[PDB]
Each structure stands twice: as C-alpha cells, then as structure tokens.
Design a protein around this ligand. Structure first.
Ligand code: NDP
Ligand code: MQU
Length: 192
C-alpha cells in the first residue's frame, strides 16, 4: 500500500488530555470500547479489512488469549523488529511506512496507541484524521494520570458531527454518553 491516509483513534480526559496511568487506562467505559471495536472493524469494500497499528507496549498489555484483535490486520512496531509477516493477522515492523509496504486488501488504517506512538506519529504527514473521544469529569484532578497527549491542535480543525457520521457510516453515535461520573462525546478533526 502506497501513502494511505492514516487515522489516529484515542480516548482522552479533558482538559489535559490524559490517556493512561501506570501502563493502563484510567477508566473502564463499556460503550466506548464497543465504539472502538465497531469503528476499527467495519469496512465498505468487499474482501477488505482494516489495519490497526500499535506500539509493542500496548500489544503486550492485551492478555495473550485476546490478541491479535480479531477481524483486523494487527501491526506491531518495535525499533528492534525486522519487517516480517508473522501470519495472516500479524505483522512486525520498525516504522509505519515500511509496515504498509507489506499489506494489500486493507481499506483503512488506524493508529491505536500508546502514548509514545501517538506523540511521535501525530507529526507524520500520513496522519490525516484524528478520532478523539473527549471525556469529561467533574473533578479531573482526582483521576490519577501519568501519560498525556502532546498534540498541536492549533493546526487541526474540529469538524461538525455530520462529518464524523459520514466517516463512521452506519455506527450509532449517541451524544453526551454518561458512565458513572464520566461524560463523553465522539469527535473528528482534520488538518487545516
Ligand atoms: N486512552 C487511550 O485511548 C489509549 C491509551 N493507551 C495507554 O498508553 C500507555 C502505553 O503507552 P506507551 O508506554 O508510551 O507505549 P506504546 O504502546 O506507545 O509502545 C512504545 C514502544 O513502541 C515502540 N515505538 C515507539 N515509537 C516507535 C516508533 N516511532 N517507531 C518504532 N517503534 C516505536 C518502541 O518499542 P521498543 O521499545 O520495542 O523499540 C517503544 O518502546 C498506557 O497508559 C496505555 O493504557 C494505549 C492505547 C489507547
Ligand atoms: C482492544 O482493546 C485494548 C485496549 C487497551 O489495550 C490494552 N484498547 C487499546 C486501544 C484502545 C482504544 C483507542 N485507541 N481509542 C479509543 N477511542 N478507545 C480505545 C479503547 C480501548 C483500547
């Protein structure tokens, strides 16, 4: 695949854009996990599937029994990896672009974490779309967090919900979803 448009998908707590704590997610939002699965798995063309790219540490954080994530091509990046096809579902690579040379019959490509991957790849021109779940809490300061997004959002535009709906197709997008003390919304951003 030559120069595909890539999208980053992440869930972050406003206003600091915290994303983790001690190698884990600082929340358990059941509906958000379901959204993440639907958006990353659905395709429109026929014999296609999407690709999900993640850093080695995120891959290792998924219980062995539950990886690879089903119905998607999984790509794992490590600076110590040679570019190799493990099986039909797993690729090892040392750079996003080298990995893509090894794929065919992929519709969309998603970067799924973690922090180091996000913070570095946001500045790569292949990234054309950010799918950010904006999480709000009454006391964000009480949620322990150690890992944060460092995105230059002044160079990006938040689109109207209509544009997101067109992006996701069929997926149901509920507004102001509440789960315990958290309230969240799905958003789409594109470059200015
Ligand atoms: N809120 C959300 O939506 C999400 C949050 N997360 C959270 O992120 C945190 C985990 O993030 P983090 O620890 O930073 O780990 P990552 O998942 O980002 O893995 C980092 C590893 O990926 C490799 N790597 C990093 N950058 C590159 C690059 N540019 N090219 C090639 N390989 C690269 C290196 O592998 P090596 O060392 O082998 O060279 C590095 O050690 C946790 O808190 C986790 O829960 C994860 C996903 C989503
Ligand atoms: C398959 O699920 C694994 C978890 C954490 O890894 C251990 N997982 C990994 C990445 C994501 C994730 C994401 N990137 N974006 C949004 N919006 N929500 C998500 C929620 C669960 C996630």
């Amino acid at each position: 695949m030559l120069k595909p448009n890539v999208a980053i998908i992440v869930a972050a707590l406003k206003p600091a854009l915290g994303i983790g704590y001690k190698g884990k997610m600082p929340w358990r939002l059941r509906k958000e996990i379901r959204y993440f699965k639907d958006v990353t798995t659905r395709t429109t063309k026929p014999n296609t599937r999407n690709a999900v790219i993640m850093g080695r540490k995120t891959w290792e954080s998924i219980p062995q029994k539950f990886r690879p994530l089903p119905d998607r091509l999984n790509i794992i990046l490590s600076r110590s990896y040679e570019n190799e096809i493990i099986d039909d579902n797993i690729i090892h690579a040392s750079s996003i672009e080298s990995s893509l040379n090894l794929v065919s019959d992929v519709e969309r490509v998603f970067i799924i974490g973690g922090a180091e991957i996000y913070n570095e790849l946001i500045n790569n021109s292949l990234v054309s779309h950010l799918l950010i779940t904006e999480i709000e809490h009454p006391s964000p300061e009480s949620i322990e967090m150690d890992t944060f997004l460092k995105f230059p959002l002044e160079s990006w535009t938040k689109q109207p919900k209509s544009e997101l709906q067109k992006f996701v197709g069929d997926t149901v997008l509920e507004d102001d979803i509440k789960e315990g003390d958290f309230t969240y919304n799905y958003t789409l951003w594109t470059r200015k």
